[PDB]
Amino acid sequence: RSMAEEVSTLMKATVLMRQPGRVQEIVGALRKGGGDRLQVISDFDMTLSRFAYNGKRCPSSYNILDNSKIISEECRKELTALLHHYYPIEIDPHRTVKEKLPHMVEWWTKAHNLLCQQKIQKFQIAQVVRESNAMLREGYKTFFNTLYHNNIPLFIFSAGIGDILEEIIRQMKVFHPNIHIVSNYMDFNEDGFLQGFKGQLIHTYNKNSSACGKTNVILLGDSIGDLTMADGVPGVQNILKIGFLNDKVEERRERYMDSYDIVLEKDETLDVVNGLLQHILC
Ligand SMILES: [Mg+2]
């Protein structure tokens, strides 16, 4: 497609809205509020990255490192053992979020620590991403170019590895300087060897703005948990929440429609988001 074809209105067949009139009010407030007040807060995996390509499942960006040749079989077995231990805690309906926090911190820290026992060098991150079949949603060029041209900050949150995310966007030539990645970044020594992780730890239950005049927000996600990503932004006046519903659609549709203003069901593209951005940014 040309970049001019990377735009769609809200009448697209993938679009669901519980309150279409409220959506129009929100969009109107964002437009009249101006580009100078806007920020975009987005999840990465299966939101900006693509779930399927002409119906064929794409690999998850979360699995790029774990599925690559730069970690040993021993390390892969240990990461699987951590998953089998901690995943039941993550999904336990009898524990509060606060109760899950120390265990998620422990899981993420142990998994990062295992990576630090490998012999990973910085240049290998780009290699493993180059060899992966991970893809960005169709229409990413217009999405990233529009936010960059209009000076709109884009905060991309991910509980995965920041270096992997960053490399995907870099290799697609859209790593523009309005992008601010909030994720788990590796720390490399002067010889380029992985020696630790930097900064705030981002796991599934603290992926929000407490980890980072832009009082108007567009939030993009694909999970129910992603609805909290703007928590911690001070003074938000208007927010539009857009959710991609990629799978388990019968189980999830009603809850997604009650919680997100716009749901995009089985939509491999950013076209509806790009159309809203063009309308909002005039
Ligand atoms: Mg996601």
List the structure tokens of 21: 């009139």
Q: How many CB atoms sit inside 10 A of residue 160's CB?
A: 20
Query: Is 105 found in the same domain as 144?
Result: no
Please indicate, yes or no, if residue 129 is contained in any of the structural domains: yes
**In the chain, how many domains are there?**
2
Does a structural domain hold residue 224?
yes
Distance between CA atoms of residues 200 and 46, nearest Å: 23
Would residue 151 be called left, alpha or beta, if left means φ above 0 and alpha means ψ between -120 and 50 degrees? left
**Distance between Cα 189 and ligand 1 center (Å):** 30
Residue 41 lies in a domain: yes
230 & 281 share domain: yes
220 and 97, same domain (yes or no): no
The verdict on 220 and 245 lying in the same domain is yes
The response to whether 66 counts as a known ligand-binding position is no
Beta-carbon contacts of residue 8 (< 8 Å; ≥ 6 apart)? 269, 271, 272, 274, 275
Of 109, 133, 157, the residue at which a domain comes to its end is 133
Output the CA 220–ligand 1 centroid distance in Å.
9
Q: Are residues 281 and 182 in the same domain?
A: yes
CA-nearest of 15, 56, 1, 25 to 237 is 25
Q: How far is the CA of 148 from the centre of ligand 1 (A)?
A: 22
DSSP string, 136-203: BPBTHHHHHHHHHHTT--EEEEEEEEHHHHHHHHHHTT---TTEEEEEE-EEE-TTSBEEEE-S----
Both tokens of residue 172?
């697609």
119 annotated to a ligand binding site: no
On whether both 68 and 124 belong to a single domain, the answer is yes
Question: How remote is the CA of residue 190 from the centroid of ligand 1, in Å?
Answer: 33
Question: Are both 156 and 230 inside the same structural domain?
Answer: yes
Burial 168-194 (b: 16+ CB within 10 A, else e): bbeeeebbeebbebbbbbbebeeeeeb
Out of 133, 152, 179, a domain closes at 133
Residue 83's domain comprises 60-133
Asked if 23 and 108 sit in the same domain, the reply is no
State the method: X-ray
158 annotated among ligand-binding-site residues: yes
Do 99 and 216 lie in one domain? The reply is no
Distance 57 CA to ligand 1 centre (A): 15
Same domain, 151 and 128: no
What Å resolution does this PDB entry report?
Answer: 1.4
> 193 in a domain, yes or no?
no
- Residues 6 or more apart whose CB falls under 8 angstroms from that of 128 comprise 64, 65, 68, 69, 70, 164
Residues 6 or more apart whose CB falls under 8 angstroms from that of 25 comprise none
In the sheet with 238-245, reading across from the earlier edge strand, the strands are 15-16, 262-265, 238-245, 216-221, 38-43, 154-161, 179-184
Residue 201, in any domain of the structure? no
Q: Which residues contact 10 (CB under 8 A, 6 or more apart)?
A: 17, 20, 23, 262, 272, 275, 276
Q: Is the residue at 256 inside a domain?
A: yes
Q: Check whether 98 is labelled as a binding-site residue.
A: no
13 annotated to bind ligand: no
Helix (H, G, I), strand (E, B) or coil at 60: coil
41 lies in the same domain as 91? no
Co-location of 105 and 129 in the same domain: yes
Which residues are tagged catalytic? 43, 45
Contact 233, 217 (CB under 8 A): yes
The verdict on residue 194 lying in a domain is no
Residue 200 lies in a domain: no
Q: In whole angstroms, give the CA distance from residue 176 to residue 151.
A: 10
